[PDB]
Structure formats: structure tokens, C-alpha cells
Design an enzyme around this catalytic site. Structure first.
Site, PDB file in Angstrom:
ATOM      1  N   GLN A   1       0.812  -1.204   0.000  1.00  9.80           N
ATOM      2  CA  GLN A   1       0.000   0.000   0.000  1.00  9.80           C
ATOM      3  C   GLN A   1       0.843   1.249   0.000  1.00  9.80           C
ATOM      4  O   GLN A   1       0.390   2.293  -0.454  1.00  9.80           O
ATOM      5  CB  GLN A   1      -0.973   0.025   1.185  1.00  9.80           C
ATOM      6  CG  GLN A   1      -0.342  -0.144   2.565  1.00  9.80           C
ATOM      7  CD  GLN A   1      -1.383  -0.181   3.673  1.00  9.80           C
ATOM      8  OE1 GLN A   1      -2.504  -0.659   3.476  1.00  9.80           O
ATOM      9  NE2 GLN A   1      -1.012   0.308   4.850  1.00  9.80           N
TER      10      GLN A   1
ATOM     11  N   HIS B   1       3.236 -12.227  -3.103  1.00  9.79           N
ATOM     12  CA  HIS B   1       3.379 -10.847  -2.650  1.00  9.79           C
ATOM     13  C   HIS B   1       4.678 -10.492  -1.926  1.00  9.79           C
ATOM     14  O   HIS B   1       5.086 -11.160  -0.975  1.00  9.79           O
ATOM     15  CB  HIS B   1       2.192 -10.463  -1.767  1.00  9.79           C
ATOM     16  CG  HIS B   1       1.990  -8.988  -1.647  1.00  9.79           C
ATOM     17  ND1 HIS B   1       1.870  -8.165  -2.746  1.00  9.79           N
ATOM     18  CD2 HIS B   1       1.871  -8.186  -0.564  1.00  9.79           C
ATOM     19  CE1 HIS B   1       1.685  -6.921  -2.347  1.00  9.79           C
ATOM     20  NE2 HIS B   1       1.682  -6.905  -1.027  1.00  9.79           N
TER      21      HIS B   1
ATOM     22  N   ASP C   1       1.190 -13.469  -7.305  1.00 11.04           N
ATOM     23  CA  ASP C   1       0.591 -12.811  -6.131  1.00 11.04           C
ATOM     24  C   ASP C   1      -0.782 -13.378  -5.736  1.00 11.04           C
ATOM     25  O   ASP C   1      -1.685 -13.459  -6.560  1.00 11.04           O
ATOM     26  CB  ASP C   1       0.455 -11.306  -6.420  1.00 11.04           C
ATOM     27  CG  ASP C   1       0.496 -10.445  -5.166  1.00 11.04           C
ATOM     28  OD1 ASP C   1      -0.365 -10.611  -4.273  1.00 11.04           O
ATOM     29  OD2 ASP C   1       1.396  -9.580  -5.086  1.00 11.04           O
TER      30      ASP C   1
END
Ligand SMILES: *[C@H]1O[C@H](CO)[C@@H](O[C@@H]2O[C@H](CO)[C@@H](O)[C@H](O)[C@H]2NC(C)=O)[C@H](O)[C@H]1NC(C)=O
Ligand SMILES: *[C@H]1O[C@H](CO)[C@@H](O)[C@H](O)[C@H]1NC(C)=O
Ligand SMILES: *[C@H]1O[C@H](CO)[C@@H](O)[C@H](O)[C@H]1NC(C)=O
Length: 279
Positions: A89, A262, A206
Site C-alpha cells: 500500500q 506478494h 501474487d
């Protein structure tokens, strides 16, 4: 002179902090090894690692940004420009900083697994083969946009519903804004294009970011949650509401992709592909 060693500003992802020896502390160490003398500023949102880690879940992102903009402004070693690198993020966040506060001037921006079009699904809960998984996400759009929820949940601020997208545009307080959803913000575009290189890293395998395409600024086609279209085919790019089309033509957008889940990468790859964008 100090030029050559452009400072690097780092912003950690969800659940992590500025200074963990294993993750963020290790990145800061590698960079410093290959680029002797470099000033590395790893953001800590809050006075404690305690509140840093929690603010990544519970603190208004619009607030986090103005706060970070304030930090960068009081650091003298960044007034001639700095590079920035965001994890997960932290990618969108640093991007927000670039559009919202052009001073000091961010130079190159490296997005490691960022969600530039947000997310619409829960980690390792693919909605294709599970009624439950698909149910849940579709039964959240019903609340994720409540003013109370938006102002307290970080994840909610970048939750992007493709189905009832009209509500997402009119009620999201963060993503919708930096993506020009309500109206074209003239400074936003000018400020983003002022960047020299915007690198978007994408983890091919991912299972945490749904859809993965979001890592390259792509997303599910409007009206549904099955298929996805790339950036080039979205209106945001068609009308160039953010300047991504002009940047693309000028070679300002770089798209990298690797195997792994990820935030899974090695020193080799890092030293090979990322280091060049910092020195
Ligand atoms: C790991 O997963 C990624 C993505 O899920 C694989 O990369 C490509 O994924 C697409 C879509 O699933 C496939 O059409 C491609 O064929 C995949 N690439 C290749 C060369 O096969 C990746 O292959 C997977 N590999 C691992 C590490 O299991
Ligand atoms: C959001 O605001 C726009 C303003 O033009 C309005 O027309 C639209 O009906 C609203 N969308 C919803 C369903 O909240
Ligand atoms: C960006 O767009 C214009 C400036 O050209 C202005 O109306 C808008 O408020 C700006 N966005 C913000 C809040 O920085």
C-alpha cells in the site's frame, strides 16, 4: 557533491513498520551498501513503532499523507529532490504524496506491489471458486463506503467496487480522489508528470492483491468482477485524466514483473533491477 547520492524515502506496507531489521531495516541496509553515503529516510507514521504498525490499519490516509508531506519539508537533505520507494500500500501512498505535495520534488518512484487501482477481494480467497469469498466482498461494498468506516479503516479507503462503481466514485475519500474520479484535479496531473520515472513492480504469482493487475494500474472491467483490462484500455488513460498517457509516450512509465507471491524477491533481483533507479 551531494547530488549524485539522491536521498531515498521509504514507506512500509500494511502491518509493517519503518525500522524492522528483517524487512524495512534490511532494505535500507542493502541500498546503503551499494550506494555509499546515501541518506535513507524510512517513514514512521506515529511516535512509536507501536502506533506506526497500527496507524497502517486504523489511521486516516489523507491525514497520514499531509503528515508525511510535513516531515519531508523539514528535512534539509531532500530540498534538491529525492527518490521514493513504497512497499504494498505504501506504493499508492507515496504516489499520493507526489500529486499532493510537489515540494520537495520527488524524482523517481518505485512501486513494489502497490495497488494503484485499489482492491476488490480478500487475500487468498479468490471469488471465482468460492461462494463465501465472493459473497463477503460483494457484501462489504454495502458498508465500505459509510463515512464512519471510510474515516477509520485504511483498507476501506482503497477498496474499489467495479460493480456499483458509482458509489465508489462518489464516496471513497482517498483512491477515488487521487485517481481523478470526481473531477480532474489539474495540479494532480501536472505534479505526477513532473516525476521522471514511475516504476511499477508486479508479482506474477501474487495471492494477496486481488486483482494482481492493479499493481500495473489495471483492473476489473466496469460492471463486473471476473475479467480485467489493462491501464491502456481504461478511460483514466483514454482521456489522460492523470497524465499517464503522456508519460507513457515519453518513456516515463516502466513495467517490471517477476515470479513469486506478494513482496517476494531476492537480493540478486533487487540489486539488478531496482538499484539502477536509485543511483
Ligand atoms: C506462478 O504464478 C504466476 C501467475 O499466477 C505464473 O505466471 C504466469 O501466469 C499466467 C496467468 O496465470 C499464465 O498464463 C502464464 O503461463 C504464467 N507464466 C508462465 C511462464 O507459465 C507463473 O508461471 C507461476 N509459476 C510458479 C512460480 O509457480
Ligand atoms: C454521486 O454523485 C453524483 C453527482 O453528479 C450523482 O449524480 C450520483 O447520483 C451519485 N451516485 C450515487 C448513486 O451515490
Ligand atoms: C488540483 O487541481 C486544482 C489545482 O490546479 C485544484 O482545484 C485542486 O484543489 C487541486 N487538488 C488538491 C486538493 O491539491
Amino acid at each position: 557533491d551531494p547530488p549524485a547520492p539522491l536521498p531515498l524515502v521509504i514507506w512500509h506496507g500494511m502491518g509493517d513498520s519503518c525500522c524492522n531489521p528483517l524487512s524495512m531495516g534490511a532494505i535500507k541496509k542493502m541500498v546503503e551498501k551499494k550506494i555509499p553515503g546515501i541518506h535513507v529516510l524510512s517513514l514512521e507514521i506515529g511516535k512509536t513503532l507501536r502506533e506506526d504498525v497500527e496507524n497502517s490499519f486504523f489511521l486516516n490516509v489523507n491525514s497520514q499523507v499531509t503528515t508525511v508531506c510535513q516531515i519531508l519539508a523539514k528535512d534539509p537533505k531532500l530540498q534538491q529532490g529525492y527518490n521514493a520507494m513504497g512497499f504494498s500500500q505504501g506504493g499508492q501512498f507515496l504516489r499520493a504524496v507526489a500529486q499532493r505535495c510537489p515540494s520537495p520534488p520527488m524524482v523517481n518512484l518505485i512501486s513494489v506491489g502497490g495497488q494503484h487501482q485499489g482492491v476488490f477481494g480478500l487475500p487468498r480467497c479468490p471469488g471465482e471458486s468460492s461462494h463465501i469469498c465472493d459473497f463477503i466482498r460483494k457484501t462489504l461494498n454495502a458498508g465500505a463506503y459509510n463515512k464512519a468506516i471510510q474515516e477509520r479503516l485504511v483498507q476501506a479507503e482503497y477498496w474499489h467496487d467495479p460493480i456499483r462503481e458509482d458509489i465508489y466514485r462518489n464516496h471513497s475519500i482517498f483512491l477515488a480522489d487521487i485517481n481523478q474520479e470526481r473531477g480532474v484535479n489539474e495540479s494532480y496531473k501536472k505534479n505526477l508528470m513532473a516525476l521522471k520515472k514511475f516504476v511499477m513492480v508486479k508479482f506474477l504469482n501474487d495471492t494477496i492483491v486481488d486483482p494482481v493487475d492493479s499493481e500495473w494500474f489495471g483492473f476489473y472491467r466496469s460492471g463486473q468482477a471476473k475479467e480485467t483490462i489493462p491501464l491502456q484500455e481504461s478511460t483514466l488513460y483514454t482521456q489522460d485524466r492523470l497524465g499517464l498517457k503522456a508519460m507513457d509516450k515519453a518513456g516515463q512509465l516502466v513495467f517490471l514483473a517477476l515470479e513469486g507471491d506478494h513482496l517476494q524477491l531476492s537480493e540478486e533481483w533487487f540489486y539488478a533491477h531496482i538499484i539502477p533507479f536509485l543511483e
